[PDB]
mmCIF file of all heavy atoms in Angstrom:
data_model
loop_
_atom_site.group_PDB
_atom_site.id
_atom_site.type_symbol
_atom_site.label_atom_id
_atom_site.label_comp_id
_atom_site.label_asym_id
_atom_site.label_seq_id
_atom_site.Cartn_x
_atom_site.Cartn_y
_atom_site.Cartn_z
ATOM 1 N N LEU A 208 -1.725 0.225 -17.747
ATOM 2 C CA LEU A 208 -2.074 1.260 -16.781
ATOM 3 C C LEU A 208 -3.563 1.583 -16.817
ATOM 4 O O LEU A 208 -4.139 1.967 -15.795
ATOM 5 C CB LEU A 208 -1.252 2.521 -17.039
ATOM 6 C CG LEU A 208 0.228 2.460 -16.666
ATOM 7 C CD1 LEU A 208 1.005 3.539 -17.394
ATOM 8 C CD2 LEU A 208 0.405 2.597 -15.168
ATOM 9 N N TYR A 209 -4.197 1.433 -17.980
ATOM 10 C CA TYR A 209 -5.616 1.712 -18.154
ATOM 11 C C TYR A 209 -6.467 0.449 -18.077
ATOM 12 O O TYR A 209 -7.537 0.382 -18.690
ATOM 13 C CB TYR A 209 -5.852 2.427 -19.482
ATOM 14 C CG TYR A 209 -4.670 3.241 -19.964
ATOM 15 C CD1 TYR A 209 -4.085 2.986 -21.198
ATOM 16 C CD2 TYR A 209 -4.137 4.261 -19.185
ATOM 17 C CE1 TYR A 209 -3.003 3.726 -21.644
ATOM 18 C CE2 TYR A 209 -3.056 5.003 -19.621
ATOM 19 C CZ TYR A 209 -2.493 4.732 -20.851
ATOM 20 O OH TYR A 209 -1.417 5.470 -21.289
ATOM 21 N N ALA A 210 -6.013 -0.555 -17.334
ATOM 22 C CA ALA A 210 -6.701 -1.830 -17.233
ATOM 23 C C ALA A 210 -7.634 -1.840 -16.030
ATOM 24 O O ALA A 210 -7.366 -1.205 -15.007
ATOM 25 C CB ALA A 210 -5.701 -2.982 -17.120
ATOM 26 N N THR A 211 -8.735 -2.575 -16.163
ATOM 27 C CA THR A 211 -9.707 -2.724 -15.089
ATOM 28 C C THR A 211 -9.593 -4.065 -14.375
ATOM 29 O O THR A 211 -10.453 -4.392 -13.552
ATOM 30 C CB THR A 211 -11.125 -2.543 -15.631
ATOM 31 O OG1 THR A 211 -11.206 -3.083 -16.954
ATOM 32 C CG2 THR A 211 -11.492 -1.071 -15.668
ATOM 33 N N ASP A 212 -8.553 -4.845 -14.665
ATOM 34 C CA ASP A 212 -8.338 -6.139 -14.033
ATOM 35 C C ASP A 212 -7.131 -6.132 -13.098
ATOM 36 O O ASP A 212 -6.395 -7.119 -13.016
ATOM 37 C CB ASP A 212 -8.208 -7.233 -15.096
ATOM 38 C CG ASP A 212 -7.036 -7.010 -16.048
ATOM 39 O OD1 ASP A 212 -5.957 -6.551 -15.620
ATOM 40 O OD2 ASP A 212 -7.205 -7.302 -17.250
ATOM 41 N N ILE A 213 -6.926 -5.025 -12.382
ATOM 42 C CA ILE A 213 -5.773 -4.909 -11.500
ATOM 43 C C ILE A 213 -5.850 -5.951 -10.392
ATOM 44 O O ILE A 213 -6.906 -6.167 -9.782
ATOM 45 C CB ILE A 213 -5.693 -3.487 -10.920
ATOM 46 C CG1 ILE A 213 -5.864 -2.453 -12.033
ATOM 47 C CG2 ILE A 213 -4.378 -3.271 -10.196
ATOM 48 C CD1 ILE A 213 -5.823 -1.028 -11.546
ATOM 49 N N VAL A 214 -4.725 -6.610 -10.135
ATOM 50 C CA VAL A 214 -4.582 -7.540 -9.024
ATOM 51 C C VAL A 214 -3.536 -6.975 -8.075
ATOM 52 O O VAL A 214 -2.509 -6.448 -8.514
ATOM 53 C CB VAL A 214 -4.192 -8.956 -9.499
ATOM 54 C CG1 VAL A 214 -5.348 -9.605 -10.235
ATOM 55 C CG2 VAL A 214 -2.962 -8.909 -10.387
ATOM 56 N N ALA A 215 -3.803 -7.062 -6.774
ATOM 57 C CA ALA A 215 -2.888 -6.493 -5.798
ATOM 58 C C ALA A 215 -2.902 -7.327 -4.528
ATOM 59 O O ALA A 215 -3.844 -8.075 -4.258
ATOM 60 C CB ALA A 215 -3.238 -5.036 -5.478
ATOM 61 N N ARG A 216 -1.823 -7.196 -3.757
ATOM 62 C CA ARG A 216 -1.713 -7.819 -2.438
ATOM 63 C C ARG A 216 -0.790 -6.924 -1.608
ATOM 64 O O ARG A 216 0.435 -7.056 -1.662
ATOM 65 C CB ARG A 216 -1.190 -9.242 -2.538
ATOM 66 C CG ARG A 216 -2.237 -10.295 -2.255
ATOM 67 C CD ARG A 216 -1.615 -11.564 -1.711
ATOM 68 N NE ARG A 216 -1.035 -12.379 -2.771
ATOM 69 C CZ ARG A 216 -1.738 -13.133 -3.605
ATOM 70 N NH1 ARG A 216 -3.058 -13.192 -3.538
ATOM 71 N NH2 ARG A 216 -1.102 -13.847 -4.528
ATOM 72 N N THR A 217 -1.396 -6.021 -0.840
ATOM 73 C CA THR A 217 -0.669 -4.975 -0.134
ATOM 74 C C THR A 217 -0.835 -5.055 1.377
ATOM 75 O O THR A 217 -0.438 -4.123 2.083
ATOM 76 C CB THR A 217 -1.107 -3.596 -0.632
ATOM 77 O OG1 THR A 217 -2.501 -3.407 -0.362
ATOM 78 C CG2 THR A 217 -0.868 -3.470 -2.127
ATOM 79 N N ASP A 218 -1.420 -6.140 1.885
ATOM 80 C CA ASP A 218 -1.508 -6.405 3.321
ATOM 81 C C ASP A 218 -2.303 -5.312 4.041
ATOM 82 O O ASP A 218 -1.805 -4.627 4.935
ATOM 83 C CB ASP A 218 -0.108 -6.560 3.921
ATOM 84 C CG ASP A 218 0.004 -7.751 4.839
ATOM 85 O OD1 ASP A 218 -0.789 -8.703 4.681
ATOM 86 O OD2 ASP A 218 0.897 -7.746 5.709
ATOM 87 N N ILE A 219 -3.559 -5.163 3.634
ATOM 88 C CA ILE A 219 -4.450 -4.191 4.258
ATOM 89 C C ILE A 219 -5.145 -4.859 5.435
ATOM 90 O O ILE A 219 -5.887 -5.830 5.264
ATOM 91 C CB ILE A 219 -5.479 -3.649 3.255
ATOM 92 C CG1 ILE A 219 -4.781 -3.010 2.060
ATOM 93 C CG2 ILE A 219 -6.382 -2.633 3.928
ATOM 94 C CD1 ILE A 219 -5.679 -2.834 0.864
ATOM 95 N N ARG A 220 -4.905 -4.342 6.635
ATOM 96 C CA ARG A 220 -5.563 -4.827 7.839
ATOM 97 C C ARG A 220 -6.482 -3.733 8.355
ATOM 98 O O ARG A 220 -6.022 -2.639 8.694
ATOM 99 C CB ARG A 220 -4.541 -5.232 8.901
ATOM 100 C CG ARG A 220 -3.557 -6.283 8.427
ATOM 101 C CD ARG A 220 -2.636 -6.723 9.542
ATOM 102 N NE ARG A 220 -2.225 -8.111 9.382
ATOM 103 C CZ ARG A 220 -1.110 -8.493 8.775
ATOM 104 N NH1 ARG A 220 -0.255 -7.611 8.286
ATOM 105 N NH2 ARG A 220 -0.842 -9.790 8.664
ATOM 106 N N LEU A 221 -7.776 -4.028 8.406
ATOM 107 C CA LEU A 221 -8.785 -3.082 8.854
ATOM 108 C C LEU A 221 -8.957 -3.207 10.360
ATOM 109 O O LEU A 221 -9.225 -4.299 10.869
ATOM 110 C CB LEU A 221 -10.110 -3.329 8.135
ATOM 111 C CG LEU A 221 -10.088 -3.025 6.639
ATOM 112 C CD1 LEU A 221 -11.380 -3.467 5.984
ATOM 113 C CD2 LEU A 221 -9.855 -1.545 6.413
ATOM 114 N N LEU A 222 -8.804 -2.092 11.064
ATOM 115 C CA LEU A 222 -8.775 -2.071 12.517
ATOM 116 C C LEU A 222 -10.124 -1.634 13.075
ATOM 117 O O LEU A 222 -10.881 -0.901 12.435
ATOM 118 C CB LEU A 222 -7.667 -1.145 13.024
ATOM 119 C CG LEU A 222 -6.285 -1.374 12.412
ATOM 120 C CD1 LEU A 222 -5.280 -0.392 12.977
ATOM 121 C CD2 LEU A 222 -5.831 -2.800 12.650
ATOM 122 N N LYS A 223 -10.417 -2.107 14.277
ATOM 123 C CA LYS A 223 -11.677 -1.770 14.923
ATOM 124 C C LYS A 223 -11.661 -0.308 15.349
ATOM 125 O O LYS A 223 -10.730 0.118 16.043
ATOM 126 C CB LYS A 223 -11.921 -2.672 16.131
ATOM 127 C CG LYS A 223 -13.336 -2.602 16.673
ATOM 128 C CD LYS A 223 -13.400 -3.014 18.130
ATOM 129 C CE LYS A 223 -14.834 -3.040 18.628
ATOM 130 N NZ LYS A 223 -15.703 -2.089 17.884
ATOM 131 N N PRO A 224 -12.646 0.491 14.946
ATOM 132 C CA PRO A 224 -12.656 1.904 15.342
ATOM 133 C C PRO A 224 -12.704 2.059 16.855
ATOM 134 O O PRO A 224 -13.405 1.324 17.553
ATOM 135 C CB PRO A 224 -13.922 2.453 14.674
ATOM 136 C CG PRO A 224 -14.754 1.255 14.361
ATOM 137 C CD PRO A 224 -13.796 0.143 14.096
ATOM 138 N N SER A 225 -11.941 3.027 17.358
ATOM 139 C CA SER A 225 -11.922 3.358 18.777
ATOM 140 C C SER A 225 -12.595 4.687 19.082
ATOM 141 O O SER A 225 -13.366 4.779 20.040
ATOM 142 C CB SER A 225 -10.480 3.392 19.292
ATOM 143 O OG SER A 225 -9.646 4.133 18.422
ATOM 144 N N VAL A 226 -12.323 5.719 18.288
ATOM 145 C CA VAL A 226 -12.885 7.036 18.550
ATOM 146 C C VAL A 226 -14.367 7.049 18.189
ATOM 147 O O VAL A 226 -14.871 6.190 17.463
ATOM 148 C CB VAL A 226 -12.114 8.127 17.789
ATOM 149 C CG1 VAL A 226 -10.864 8.514 18.551
ATOM 150 C CG2 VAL A 226 -11.759 7.645 16.396
ATOM 151 N N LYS A 227 -15.076 8.045 18.721
ATOM 152 C CA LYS A 227 -16.507 8.148 18.477
ATOM 153 C C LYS A 227 -16.815 8.655 17.076
ATOM 154 O O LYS A 227 -17.814 8.241 16.479
ATOM 155 C CB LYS A 227 -17.154 9.058 19.523
ATOM 156 C CG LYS A 227 -16.460 10.395 19.694
ATOM 157 C CD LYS A 227 -16.591 10.905 21.116
ATOM 158 C CE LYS A 227 -17.986 11.441 21.378
ATOM 159 N NZ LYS A 227 -18.096 12.881 21.023
ATOM 160 N N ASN A 228 -15.976 9.533 16.535
ATOM 161 C CA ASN A 228 -16.198 10.057 15.197
ATOM 162 C C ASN A 228 -15.978 8.965 14.157
ATOM 163 O O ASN A 228 -15.161 8.059 14.339
ATOM 164 C CB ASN A 228 -15.268 11.237 14.935
ATOM 165 C CG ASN A 228 -15.059 12.094 16.168
ATOM 166 O OD1 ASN A 228 -14.079 11.928 16.890
ATOM 167 N ND2 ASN A 228 -15.984 13.012 16.418
ATOM 168 N N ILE A 229 -16.733 9.056 13.059
ATOM 169 C CA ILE A 229 -16.671 8.033 12.023
ATOM 170 C C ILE A 229 -15.255 7.954 11.469
ATOM 171 O O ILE A 229 -14.625 8.975 11.162
ATOM 172 C CB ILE A 229 -17.711 8.316 10.927
ATOM 173 C CG1 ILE A 229 -17.784 7.147 9.945
ATOM 174 C CG2 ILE A 229 -17.429 9.630 10.216
ATOM 175 C CD1 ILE A 229 -18.548 5.961 10.476
ATOM 176 N N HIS A 230 -14.732 6.736 11.376
ATOM 177 C CA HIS A 230 -13.336 6.543 11.023
ATOM 178 C C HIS A 230 -13.158 5.160 10.419
ATOM 179 O O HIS A 230 -13.842 4.207 10.802
ATOM 180 C CB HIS A 230 -12.433 6.709 12.251
ATOM 181 C CG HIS A 230 -10.995 6.963 11.923
ATOM 182 N ND1 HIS A 230 -10.597 7.858 10.955
ATOM 183 C CD2 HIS A 230 -9.860 6.444 12.446
ATOM 184 C CE1 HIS A 230 -9.277 7.874 10.890
ATOM 185 N NE2 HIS A 230 -8.806 7.025 11.785
ATOM 186 N N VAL A 231 -12.235 5.062 9.471
ATOM 187 C CA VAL A 231 -11.788 3.766 8.973
ATOM 188 C C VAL A 231 -10.311 3.631 9.315
ATOM 189 O O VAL A 231 -9.450 4.038 8.524
ATOM 190 C CB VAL A 231 -12.024 3.612 7.464
ATOM 191 C CG1 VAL A 231 -11.605 2.225 7.009
ATOM 192 C CG2 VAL A 231 -13.474 3.846 7.138
ATOM 193 N N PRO A 232 -9.975 3.090 10.484
ATOM 194 C CA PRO A 232 -8.563 2.872 10.810
ATOM 195 C C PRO A 232 -8.030 1.670 10.048
ATOM 196 O O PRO A 232 -8.636 0.597 10.048
ATOM 197 C CB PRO A 232 -8.575 2.628 12.321
ATOM 198 C CG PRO A 232 -9.950 2.167 12.627
ATOM 199 C CD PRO A 232 -10.873 2.733 11.594
ATOM 200 N N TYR A 233 -6.894 1.861 9.389
ATOM 201 C CA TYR A 233 -6.306 0.810 8.580
ATOM 202 C C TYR A 233 -4.796 0.889 8.696
ATOM 203 O O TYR A 233 -4.230 1.917 9.073
ATOM 204 C CB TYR A 233 -6.725 0.915 7.108
ATOM 205 C CG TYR A 233 -6.044 2.035 6.357
ATOM 206 C CD1 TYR A 233 -5.172 1.766 5.314
ATOM 207 C CD2 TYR A 233 -6.271 3.360 6.694
ATOM 208 C CE1 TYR A 233 -4.547 2.786 4.628
ATOM 209 C CE2 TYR A 233 -5.648 4.386 6.011
ATOM 210 C CZ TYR A 233 -4.788 4.093 4.980
ATOM 211 O OH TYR A 233 -4.167 5.112 4.298
ATOM 212 N N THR A 234 -4.150 -0.222 8.372
ATOM 213 C CA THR A 234 -2.702 -0.284 8.303
ATOM 214 C C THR A 234 -2.313 -1.113 7.089
ATOM 215 O O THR A 234 -3.061 -1.990 6.649
ATOM 216 C CB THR A 234 -2.107 -0.860 9.597
ATOM 217 O OG1 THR A 234 -0.680 -0.887 9.500
ATOM 218 C CG2 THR A 234 -2.637 -2.258 9.863
ATOM 219 N N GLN A 235 -1.139 -0.818 6.538
ATOM 220 C CA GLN A 235 -0.763 -1.355 5.241
ATOM 221 C C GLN A 235 0.747 -1.507 5.166
ATOM 222 O O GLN A 235 1.489 -0.875 5.922
ATOM 223 C CB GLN A 235 -1.250 -0.445 4.111
ATOM 224 C CG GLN A 235 -1.654 -1.162 2.846
ATOM 225 C CD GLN A 235 -2.140 -0.203 1.786
ATOM 226 O OE1 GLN A 235 -1.876 0.996 1.855
ATOM 227 N NE2 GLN A 235 -2.851 -0.722 0.796
ATOM 228 N N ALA A 236 1.191 -2.351 4.242
ATOM 229 C CA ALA A 236 2.612 -2.500 3.990
ATOM 230 C C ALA A 236 3.109 -1.373 3.092
ATOM 231 O O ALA A 236 2.338 -0.712 2.390
ATOM 232 C CB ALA A 236 2.905 -3.857 3.352
ATOM 233 N N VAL A 237 4.421 -1.151 3.126
ATOM 234 C CA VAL A 237 5.004 -0.106 2.297
ATOM 235 C C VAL A 237 4.876 -0.484 0.827
ATOM 236 O O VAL A 237 4.722 -1.654 0.460
ATOM 237 C CB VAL A 237 6.471 0.138 2.679
ATOM 238 C CG1 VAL A 237 6.576 0.577 4.127
ATOM 239 C CG2 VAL A 237 7.291 -1.109 2.422
ATOM 240 N N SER A 238 4.934 0.530 -0.029
ATOM 241 C CA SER A 238 4.858 0.297 -1.463
ATOM 242 C C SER A 238 6.085 -0.484 -1.915
ATOM 243 O O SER A 238 7.222 -0.060 -1.679
ATOM 244 C CB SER A 238 4.752 1.621 -2.212
ATOM 245 O OG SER A 238 4.262 1.423 -3.525
ATOM 246 N N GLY A 239 5.853 -1.632 -2.549
ATOM 247 C CA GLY A 239 6.962 -2.412 -3.066
ATOM 248 C C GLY A 239 7.719 -1.684 -4.155
ATOM 249 O O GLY A 239 8.939 -1.815 -4.260
ATOM 250 N N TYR A 240 7.008 -0.900 -4.966
ATOM 251 C CA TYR A 240 7.667 -0.070 -5.967
ATOM 252 C C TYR A 240 8.621 0.926 -5.317
ATOM 253 O O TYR A 240 9.765 1.073 -5.758
ATOM 254 C CB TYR A 240 6.613 0.654 -6.801
ATOM 255 C CG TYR A 240 7.155 1.434 -7.969
ATOM 256 C CD1 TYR A 240 7.797 0.797 -9.018
ATOM 257 C CD2 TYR A 240 7.006 2.809 -8.033
ATOM 258 C CE1 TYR A 240 8.284 1.510 -10.088
ATOM 259 C CE2 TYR A 240 7.488 3.528 -9.097
ATOM 260 C CZ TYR A 240 8.126 2.875 -10.122
ATOM 261 O OH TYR A 240 8.607 3.595 -11.187
ATOM 262 N N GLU A 241 8.175 1.602 -4.256
ATOM 263 C CA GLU A 241 9.035 2.569 -3.576
ATOM 264 C C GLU A 241 10.213 1.884 -2.889
ATOM 265 O O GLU A 241 11.343 2.390 -2.924
ATOM 266 C CB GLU A 241 8.218 3.370 -2.565
ATOM 267 C CG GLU A 241 7.273 4.378 -3.191
ATOM 268 C CD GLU A 241 7.976 5.636 -3.647
ATOM 269 O OE1 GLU A 241 9.126 5.865 -3.223
ATOM 270 O OE2 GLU A 241 7.376 6.398 -4.432
ATOM 271 N N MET A 242 9.967 0.737 -2.254
ATOM 272 C CA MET A 242 11.054 0.013 -1.602
ATOM 273 C C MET A 242 12.094 -0.448 -2.614
ATOM 274 O O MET A 242 13.303 -0.327 -2.374
ATOM 275 C CB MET A 242 10.494 -1.173 -0.818
ATOM 276 C CG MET A 242 11.554 -2.028 -0.154
ATOM 277 S SD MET A 242 11.098 -2.477 1.525
ATOM 278 C CE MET A 242 11.062 -0.859 2.289
ATOM 279 N N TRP A 243 11.646 -0.967 -3.758
ATOM 280 C CA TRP A 243 12.579 -1.346 -4.810
ATOM 281 C C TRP A 243 13.321 -0.133 -5.348
ATOM 282 O O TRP A 243 14.514 -0.213 -5.652
ATOM 283 C CB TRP A 243 11.846 -2.063 -5.941
ATOM 284 C CG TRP A 243 12.697 -2.244 -7.154
ATOM 285 C CD1 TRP A 243 13.703 -3.149 -7.320
ATOM 286 C CD2 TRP A 243 12.632 -1.490 -8.367
ATOM 287 N NE1 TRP A 243 14.264 -3.011 -8.565
ATOM 288 C CE2 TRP A 243 13.624 -1.997 -9.227
ATOM 289 C CE3 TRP A 243 11.828 -0.436 -8.811
ATOM 290 C CZ2 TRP A 243 13.833 -1.488 -10.502
ATOM 291 C CZ3 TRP A 243 12.039 0.067 -10.075
ATOM 292 C CH2 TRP A 243 13.032 -0.458 -10.908
ATOM 293 N N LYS A 244 12.631 1.001 -5.477
ATOM 294 C CA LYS A 244 13.286 2.212 -5.957
ATOM 295 C C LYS A 244 14.405 2.632 -5.017
ATOM 296 O O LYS A 244 15.467 3.082 -5.462
ATOM 297 C CB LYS A 244 12.262 3.334 -6.108
ATOM 298 C CG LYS A 244 11.722 3.485 -7.511
ATOM 299 C CD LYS A 244 10.484 4.356 -7.532
ATOM 300 C CE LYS A 244 10.748 5.725 -6.946
ATOM 301 N NZ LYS A 244 9.531 6.573 -7.010
ATOM 302 N N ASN A 245 14.183 2.494 -3.710
ATOM 303 C CA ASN A 245 15.245 2.805 -2.760
ATOM 304 C C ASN A 245 16.353 1.757 -2.783
ATOM 305 O O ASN A 245 17.518 2.084 -2.531
ATOM 306 C CB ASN A 245 14.670 2.946 -1.352
ATOM 307 C CG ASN A 245 15.276 4.108 -0.589
ATOM 308 O OD1 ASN A 245 15.315 5.233 -1.082
ATOM 309 N ND2 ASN A 245 15.751 3.841 0.622
ATOM 310 N N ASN A 246 16.022 0.501 -3.088
ATOM 311 C CA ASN A 246 17.026 -0.558 -3.096
ATOM 312 C C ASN A 246 17.201 -1.185 -4.475
ATOM 313 O O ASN A 246 17.257 -2.413 -4.596
ATOM 314 C CB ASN A 246 16.667 -1.639 -2.075
ATOM 315 C CG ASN A 246 16.247 -1.062 -0.742
ATOM 316 O OD1 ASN A 246 16.895 -0.161 -0.211
ATOM 317 N ND2 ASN A 246 15.160 -1.581 -0.188
ATOM 318 N N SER A 247 17.290 -0.363 -5.522
ATOM 319 C CA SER A 247 17.347 -0.902 -6.876
ATOM 320 C C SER A 247 18.769 -1.186 -7.338
ATOM 321 O O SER A 247 18.966 -2.003 -8.244
ATOM 322 C CB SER A 247 16.668 0.054 -7.858
ATOM 323 O OG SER A 247 17.035 1.398 -7.605
ATOM 324 N N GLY A 248 19.761 -0.538 -6.747
ATOM 325 C CA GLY A 248 21.121 -0.710 -7.202
ATOM 326 C C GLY A 248 21.399 0.101 -8.455
ATOM 327 O O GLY A 248 20.611 0.950 -8.879
ATOM 328 N N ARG A 249 22.555 -0.172 -9.051
ATOM 329 C CA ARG A 249 22.799 0.620 -10.245
ATOM 330 C C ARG A 249 22.300 -0.117 -11.485
ATOM 331 O O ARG A 249 22.316 -1.351 -11.530
ATOM 332 C CB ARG A 249 24.287 0.927 -10.388
ATOM 333 C CG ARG A 249 24.934 1.497 -9.134
ATOM 334 C CD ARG A 249 24.332 2.829 -8.706
ATOM 335 N NE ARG A 249 24.133 3.753 -9.815
ATOM 336 C CZ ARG A 249 23.395 4.852 -9.746
ATOM 337 N NH1 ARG A 249 22.778 5.200 -8.629
ATOM 338 N NH2 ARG A 249 23.271 5.620 -10.824
ATOM 339 N N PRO A 250 21.847 0.609 -12.500
ATOM 340 C CA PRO A 250 21.238 -0.045 -13.664
ATOM 341 C C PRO A 250 22.261 -0.767 -14.528
ATOM 342 O O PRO A 250 23.480 -0.668 -14.355
ATOM 343 C CB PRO A 250 20.589 1.114 -14.430
ATOM 344 C CG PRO A 250 21.269 2.340 -13.935
ATOM 345 C CD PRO A 250 21.651 2.067 -12.518
ATOM 346 N N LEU A 251 21.722 -1.524 -15.487
ATOM 347 C CA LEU A 251 22.540 -2.181 -16.495
ATOM 348 C C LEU A 251 23.292 -1.183 -17.361
ATOM 349 O O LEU A 251 24.345 -1.523 -17.903
ATOM 350 C CB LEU A 251 21.671 -3.075 -17.379
ATOM 351 C CG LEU A 251 21.689 -4.576 -17.099
ATOM 352 C CD1 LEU A 251 20.625 -5.270 -17.927
ATOM 353 C CD2 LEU A 251 23.058 -5.158 -17.390
#
């Protein structure tokens, strides 16, 4: 948890700003941890 060599692949797509105010529009995939938590089944 305290490591500086984190590797990730979360499907970050950076979108072209449309509004005049400064903005970083982005879209991303759902958290795999959260999705697994919802679909984990019953434990051993």
Side-chain angles (χ1 to χ4, degrees):
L208 288 160
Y209 332 122
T211 35
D212 61 38
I213 312 179
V214 290
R216 252 208 281 283
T217 62
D218 226 24
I219 302 163
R220 303 184 149 94
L221 293 173
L222 309 179
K223 193 204 184 332
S225 47
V226 278
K227 50 211 285 272
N228 323 96
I229 188 77
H230 199 45
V231 183
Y233 74 115
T234 181
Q235 214 179 18
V237 300
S238 198
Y240 186 64
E241 288 282 344
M242 177 136 296
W243 169 76
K244 264 166 57 178
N245 221 51
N246 314 314
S247 44
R249 310 298 315 166
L251 259 172

